[PDB]
Design a protein around this ligand. Structure first.
Ligand SMILES: Nc1nc2c(ncn2[C@@H]2O[C@H](COP(=O)(O)OP(=O)(O)OP(=O)(O)O)[C@@H](O)[C@H]2O)c(=O)[nH]1
Ligand SMILES: COc1cc2c(c(OC)c1OC)-c1ccc(OC)c(=O)cc1[C@@H](NC(C)=O)CC2
Ligand SMILES: Nc1nc2c(ncn2[C@@H]2O[C@H](COP(=O)(O)OP(=O)(O)O)[C@@H](O)[C@H]2O)c(=O)[nH]1
Ligand SMILES: [Mg+2]
Lengths: 13, 420, 127, 430
């Protein structure tokens, strides 16, 4: 299973 | 922006979500049948935000456990909900985040998103999503976060709001809860715009110490949650005297994208009306916080205060000002005017005057420290780790989430000590 | 190998397996690669009857894995009250510190196992 | 005639427009449906031929709630329906949403509607733009509109009436960022801008009208009284400021320093008991009292670049000259070095008008002084300081970068503001 990376949601801004 | 799409997942999610609809239905005069029986056009001006015209809540009920849909459907207001909106499985999540995020949850998630999608497409203009879930269990936590990420993928430009209950052993002495909540908090820092931290630890303490309840039940704690959720949504639901949606709120409350975890509060707490000084004092009191953090241990980045009821605005403005003036130390000085007040003339049921508090405080790191210490205690003895990896979940996700949450803690700490 | 079968049987709560394995000579103080014994694993997963059976038959109540974890550590951590009491009744080191500096009391406190916190205090736990 | 098109952008701009057009109708005897019992007010109203007078005005907001009230309210028949323009979701107090992501969705529609008004002008002078500094739309979409209008109407003048945010009147934490961003992008595109400090209007309603908590209506009717004072010359065929270009000529010797201070008198409560009407001298002296300024700042501190006095009502020219002469002997009026020191005088002889039943008493003579003074730099400095405090932590910046704006535009704007503060400092250094 691939998992969410740190800062991956920061890309939206 | 107008409409809000409500999602409730898991046991905790559905029980607080049900209580939320009862309170605000009563506030809007929507009866258990979906019939309007209110006494003022104010109650109906923004009914559209949470209801579809009889009035049907724009809510999607989700669980991997079957029985919780039975228990809400026969709940006090269980008939208002659209039947088609109930999306549930039979397996269950077994308090296992990885079952909720990756296996049992992944099998049910596309079915939910089809209901979400048809609720979205019916909206004039979509304002965002709000989710009620617990972080200590399996469905609300694991599948709730899977839903959050799916919605964020399909609606990248919409606001994601969450009311997330934090685990406390005082309420559920289940030792895998720090695992599930850390995995979830990782999801939350990346993918939500606003998260109200509903801390079961604080809920229990309030009920036990403040309310003098010897053995607080989920009904007692949910009483505080429902009142908190009514209060923080007051400006969405009642005519202002404020022209603002969820996005304008997020813009002004969140100075840094990851620091979007709010410490909600309420006054007066309950299970004679207060004066405006009383309201103001109690609203900033640690005892009134729904997150088990001492705000005098940190600093406020931003604060929103909502007063409900007929009251003197010049008294409110003065109370708020002297609190900031008398305790300037507790407020970050490089965000001018970061304490905002709004007032609504409609009070909640059974009350003449109330005040709801939304604080973006660096003291919330104490909540995450508490969870982190419990996660580290379990993780270092590697207990029950196979329950998760056995569902296909990489072990590295554990250390990844723990690192992200610990990064969150220090990020609060540096703004706590930043000077201007 | 009987030791590893016993280890698996203790972790899984297989009461009859534990008995039969022991009847065939299984090493009660077998260790896995990280030093965990059958008593560690039964204490961790809440298997009270196997805990008592292991201790009736020569299990080291104070065995430590690689990380200095005693069985009392793990039961105090996971929250197994009756097992905590049984380990103490058989002489578990109430003040044992593992490789992280933690006593069983401290793990009980961190996890909010308050009945266990009290039990350890009754049995001379330090703080 | 010599038409001016008024554009109202965002909530503040729409609601001030409502008050302004309400007052204009009263001043010219036009009814809420455009009817009334070659006229000079034809600059601001088209004339059909059935005697319907239609404001040369566009209302734009990125959400519909405020403009919906115009379409349903007392003046629902005053404006062309196609004049009132709304999107679906607003700029969320975010300049970048107003200027880039959301604003580009509707900018062409706004320009088409403006083009249709312009095509009904024989000799368009330019535009009057009303907007808040703090709003995502008022700041961000205004800047986009002003850039586009400079290209599509290259030789036309553009004037601004903009609302300066104040903690006492519903500001938000990001507003300072919005104020700087709009000011920087608009600066090269505006010939003259009149700033209204919400705290000054607030102060005046509280002091002069004894309104403890002024509503927007309270504030906007006062604002519209000053705005009407400023645009009267365009609607009554004046001798002074007879066209938009003349505002630059009369008030703005240095193009960047184009923010005159408005001081208005007298503001008198309609509830006050009978009293003698104030003379020309009395209302002229009041033009030099800080409490009457539209922007809070200390004029004693600054120097004047230009100064016009716009009188309305029962005002005899010799009495103006005597009052001004008295001022020059008694007040310390310093002009910057290379600007002529004459006051320019306009007199409109029509009685000043108030909304019937409003807070403002009807008076026999009123005056609005427009002074381009370096003292208003103090207001830019207040703004700039609030911007600096947040920006040093990059607080809230990510919201802007996520909506089509590059982070460098923040420092580019702030640098422009710093040069503007130095413009003020250097023009008035002894
Ligand atoms: N004086 C006055 N100020 C107003 C009025 N309406 C809003 N404001 C001010 O304008 C600023 C808020 O921006 P708005 O104009 O409401 O926002 P907007 O232009 O609609 O932009 P968005 O709503 O963010 O899309 C604040 O500083 C308010 O105090 C008004 O009617 N009169
Ligand atoms: C949809 O409901 C709300 C929306 C908003 C605000 C708010 O708190 C008072 C709300 O009620 C919960 C808000 C919040 C905080 C601010 O600064 C911390 C701000 O600048 C500004 C605000 C609001 N604006 C004002 C002038 O209060 C706009 C966003
Ligand atoms: N405050 C509150 N907490 C709850 C409620 N139901 C469950 N919880 C908490 O949620 C966590 C368990 O998650 P749960 O929702 O029951 O599991 P799920 O069904 O897999 O999402 C524990 O921390 C419980 O204390 C409730 O009604 N109110
Ligand atoms: Mg707006």
């Amino acid at each position: 299973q691939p998992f969410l990376k740190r800062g991956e949601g920061l890309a939206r801004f | 922006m107008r409409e809000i799409v409500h999602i409730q997942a898991g046991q905790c999610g559905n029980q607080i979500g049900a209580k939320f609809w009862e309170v605000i239905s009563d506030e809007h005069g929507i009866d258990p049948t979906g019939s309007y029986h209110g006494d003022s056009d104010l109650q109906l001006e923004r009914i559209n935000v949470y209801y579809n015209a009889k009035y049907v809540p724009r809510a999607i009920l989700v669980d991997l456990e079957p029985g919780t849909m039975d228990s809400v459907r026969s709940g006090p207001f269980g008939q208002i909900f659209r039947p088609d909106n109930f999306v549930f499985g039979q397996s269950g999540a077994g308090n296992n985040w990885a079952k909720g995020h990756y296996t049992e949850g992944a099998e049910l998630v596309d079915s939910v998103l089809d209901v979400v999608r048809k609720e979205s497409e019916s909206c004039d203009c979509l304002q965002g999503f709000q989710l009620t879930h617990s972080l200590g269990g399996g469905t609300g936590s694991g599948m709730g976060t899977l839903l959050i990420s799916k919605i964020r993928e399909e609606y990248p430009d919409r606001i994601m709001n969450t009311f997330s209950v934090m685990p406390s052993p005082k309420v559920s002495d289940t030792v895998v809860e720090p695992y599930n909540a850390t995995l979830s908090v990782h999801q939350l820092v990346e993918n939500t715009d606003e998260t109200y931290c509903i801390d079961n630890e604080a809920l229990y303490d309030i009920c036990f110490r403040t309310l003098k309840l010897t053995t607080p039940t989920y009904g007692d704690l949910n009483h505080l949650v429902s009142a908190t959720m009514s209060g923080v949504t007051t400006c969405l639901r009642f005519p202002g005297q404020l022209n603002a949606d969820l996005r304008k709120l997020a813009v002004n409350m969140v100075p840094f994208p990851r620091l979007h975890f709010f410490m909600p509060g309420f006054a007066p707490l309950t299970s004679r009306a207060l004066t405006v000084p009383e309201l103001t004092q109690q609203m900033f009191d640690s005892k009134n916080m729904m997150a088990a953090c001492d705000p005098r241990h940190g600093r406020y980045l931003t604060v929103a205060a909502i007063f409900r009821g007929r009251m003197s605005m010049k008294e409110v403005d003065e109370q708020m000002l002297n609190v900031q003036n008398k305790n300037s130390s507790y407020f970050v000085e490089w965000i001018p005017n970061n304490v905002k007040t709004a007032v609504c003339d409609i009070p909640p049921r059974g009350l003449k005057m109330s005040a709801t508090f939304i604080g973006n405080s660096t003291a919330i790191q104490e909540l995450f420290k508490r969870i982190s210490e419990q996660f580290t205690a379990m993780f270092r003895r590697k207990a029950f780790l196979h329950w998760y990896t056995g569902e296909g979940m990489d072990e590295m996700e554990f250390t990844e989430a723990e690192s992200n949450m610990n990064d969150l803690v220090s990020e609060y700490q540096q703004y706590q000590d930043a000077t201007a | 190998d009987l030791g590893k079968k016993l280890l698996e049987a203790a972790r899984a709560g297989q009461d009859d397996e534990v008995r039969i394995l022991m009847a065939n000579g299984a090493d009660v103080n077998a260790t896995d690669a990280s030093g965990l014994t059958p008593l560690h694993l039964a204490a961790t997963y809440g298997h009270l009857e196997i805990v008592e059976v292991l201790l009736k038959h020569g299990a080291d109540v104070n065995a430590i894995d690689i990380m200095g974890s005693t069985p009392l550590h793990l039961a105090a951590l996971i929250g197994h009250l009756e097992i905590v009491e049984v380990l103490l009744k058989h002489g578990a080191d109430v003040n044992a510190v593992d490789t992280w500096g933690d006593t069983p009391l401290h793990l009980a406190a961190i996890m909010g196992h308050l009945e266990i916190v009290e039990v350890l205090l009754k049995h001379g736990a330090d703080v | 005639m010599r038409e001016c098109i008024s554009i109202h952008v965002g909530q503040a701009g729409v609601q001030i427009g409502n008050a302004c057009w309400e007052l204009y109708c009263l001043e010219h005897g036009i009814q809420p449906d455009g009817q009334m019992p070659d006229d000079s007010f034809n600059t601001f109203f088209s004339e059909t031929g059935a005697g319907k007078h239609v404001p040369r005005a566009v209302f734009v907001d990125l959400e519909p709630t405020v403009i919906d009230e115009v379409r349903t309210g007392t003046y629902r028949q005053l404006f062309h329906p196609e004049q009132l323009i709304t999107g679906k979701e607003d700029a969320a107090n975010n300049y970048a949403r107003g200027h880039y992501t959301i604003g580009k969705e509707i900018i062409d529609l706004v320009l088409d509607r403006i083009r249709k008004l312009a095509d009904q002008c024989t000799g368009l002078q330019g535009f009057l733009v009303f907007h808040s500094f703090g709003g995502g739309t008022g700041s961000g979409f205004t800047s986009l509109l002003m850039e586009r209008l400079s290209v599509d109407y290259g030789k036309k003048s553009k004037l601004e009436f903009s609302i300066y945010p104040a903690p006492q009147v519903s500001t938000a934490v990001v507003e300072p960022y919005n104020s700087i961003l709009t000011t920087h992008t608009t600066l090269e595109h505006s010939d003259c801008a009149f700033m209204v400090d919400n705290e000054a209007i607030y102060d005046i309603c509280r002091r002069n009208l004894d309104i403890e908590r002024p509503t927007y209506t309270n504030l906007n009717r006062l604002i519209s009284q000053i705005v009407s004072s400023i645009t009267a010359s365009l609607r009554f065929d004046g001798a002074l400021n007879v066209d938009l270009t003349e505002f630059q000529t009369n008030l703005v010797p240095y193009p960047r320093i184009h923010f005159p201070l408005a001081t208005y008198a007298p503001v008198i409560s309609a509830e006050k008991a009978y009293h003698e009407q104030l003379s020309v001298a009395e209302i002229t002296n009041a033009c030099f009292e800080p409490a009457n300024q539209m922007v809070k700042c200390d004029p004693r501190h600054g120097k004047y670049m230009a100064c016009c006095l716009l009188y309305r009502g029962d005002v005899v020219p010799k009495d103006v000259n005597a009052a001004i002469a008295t001022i020059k002997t008694k007040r310390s009026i310093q002009f910057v070095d290379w600007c002529p020191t004459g006051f320019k005088v306009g007199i409109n002889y029509q009685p000043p008008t108030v909304v019937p039943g409003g807070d403002l008493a009807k008076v026999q003579r009123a005056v609005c002084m427009l002074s381009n003074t370096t003292a208003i730099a103090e207001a830019w400095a207040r703004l700039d300081h609030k911007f600096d405090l947040m920006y040093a932590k990059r607080a809230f910046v990510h919201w802007y970068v996520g909506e089509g704006m590059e982070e460098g535009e923040f420092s580019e704007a702030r640098e422009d503001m710093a040069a503007l503060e130095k413009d003020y400092e250097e023009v008035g250094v002894d």
